[PDB]
Amino acid sequence: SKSEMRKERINIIKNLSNDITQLKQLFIEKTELLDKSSSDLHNVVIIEG
């Protein structure tokens, strides 16, 4: 029991870490994509002449 209970603890903690991994990967990815669009926006500007 308790051996496999601990293994399935590890499994559900692994699932939770997969959820955190989804959070990190996709949100940092789309955030850096927003930053790419920001350099398209905030860093492609015309003012002077």
Binding site: S39, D40, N43, V44
Partner: peptide
């Protein structure tokens, strides 16, 4: 740092 829109210009 350096950007590609530099190279676009």
């Amino acid at each position: 740092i350096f950007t590609k829109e530099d190279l676009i210009n």
